[PDB]
Amino acid sequence: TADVQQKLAELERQSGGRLGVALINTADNSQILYRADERFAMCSTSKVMAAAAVLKKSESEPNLLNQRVEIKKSDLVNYNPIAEKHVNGTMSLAELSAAALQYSDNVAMNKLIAHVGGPASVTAFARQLGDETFRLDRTEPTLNTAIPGDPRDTTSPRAMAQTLRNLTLGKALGDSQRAQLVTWMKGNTTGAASIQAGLPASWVVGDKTGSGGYGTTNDIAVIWPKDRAPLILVTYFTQPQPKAESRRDVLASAAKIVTDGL
Amino acid sequence: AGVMTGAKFTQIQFGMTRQQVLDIAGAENCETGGSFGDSIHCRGHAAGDYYAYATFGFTSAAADAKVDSKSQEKLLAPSAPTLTLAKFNQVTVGMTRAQVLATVGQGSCTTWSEYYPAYPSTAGVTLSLSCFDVDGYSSTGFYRGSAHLWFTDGVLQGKRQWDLV
């Protein structure tokens, strides 16, 4: 509706930034789109794609998630709450996927990226899923610079919503792999202040947030509303000042606007 | 009162028991088990996609076990950050900790991780410093000029930097 568009435009204007939203309602395949074809830096929301690339690989190598990966001091990057425990030891690919998705562990992310062959290989996975917009160019931490106008490590809300639908609800992954991805995302340790804060408490959410330079504040989610078919919601937000503080509440506000009435 | 903080992290000492750590950190902020094993992980304020935090490792799983490892992110600000890309380039693998600190600035670094595998002995100590340029540190957001310097037995084993100038 034009009403929802005006409310999102007003939220964006009040926030001072640039807001991108894509909602898919799988009950009727309807969408709500706001700047949905513009590019936004994904920041840690890209961890979903990297974990999914490893899950896809595991369809051809079913013991893959149990494979061990060495963690060394040279691998450390900021936001390493899980990997730091295992320096000079190992973590399984399952542990790395869970750490990336549930603690936003950036060392875990870099191990997932490296496992599939590097950022271009994650992009190639996106292409294999029919996503022509996603591009992963860098590893952590530099993928989070979020410089306005820089297309590196960006996607569009429309593309990410369709891809997240295909991964979490559709057939992009095998049944067991799709279930594992959803299980991991349902266990994220944050997200409560982002999309979830704009939704009724009874709704079940699997999400992944992202944050970066320029006050970039993102969240992508699969949502099971009470007594309803699931939704996919992508909310991306970025700001003009390099040092802007995060605005998770803007994502909550966008989520409330686009789900009002469900 | 409140979440995990840098002041609490500094008050916690190597050699303290689990309950001494919880006395200072505030057990409402802390957890064990799961991904943290028998360590104690304590959350500070929301930051990025997680939280500022500390993780404390102990000499064993026992109740009388002592802190042998302290790790943190975003709890401690550098006291007088003066690191630059030139100074980072002056740091050389094989330098001692004292030589590195004189090079990067005595107020540029905070301790990211510090572990004594032979606690209370210092033999085998491993140390990771997170070091920052004048405006690189942020307790909530994306770093804007930082470096990781790591040591074993007080000797620099490697260095990495992001966004120094």
TrEMBL record, chain A:
<keyword id="KW-0472">Membrane</keyword>
<dbReference type="GO" id="GO:0030655">
    <property type="term" value="P:beta-lactam antibiotic catabolic process"/>
</dbReference>
<keyword id="KW-0812">Transmembrane</keyword>
<feature type="domain" description="Beta-lactamase class A catalytic">
    <location>
        <begin position="21"/>
        <end position="235"/>
    </location>
</feature>
<keyword id="KW-0378">Hydrolase</keyword>
<dbReference type="GO" id="GO:0046677">
    <property type="term" value="P:response to antibiotic"/>
</dbReference>
<keyword id="KW-0732">Signal</keyword>
<dbReference type="GO" id="GO:0008800">
    <property type="term" value="F:beta-lactamase activity"/>
</dbReference>
<keyword id="KW-0046">Antibiotic resistance</keyword>
<protein>
    <recommendedName>
        <fullName>Beta-lactamase</fullName>
        <ecNumber>3.5.2.6</ecNumber>
    </recommendedName>
</protein>
<keyword id="KW-0614">Plasmid</keyword>
<keyword id="KW-1133">Transmembrane helix</keyword>
<comment type="similarity">
    <text>Belongs to the class-A beta-lactamase family.</text>
</comment>
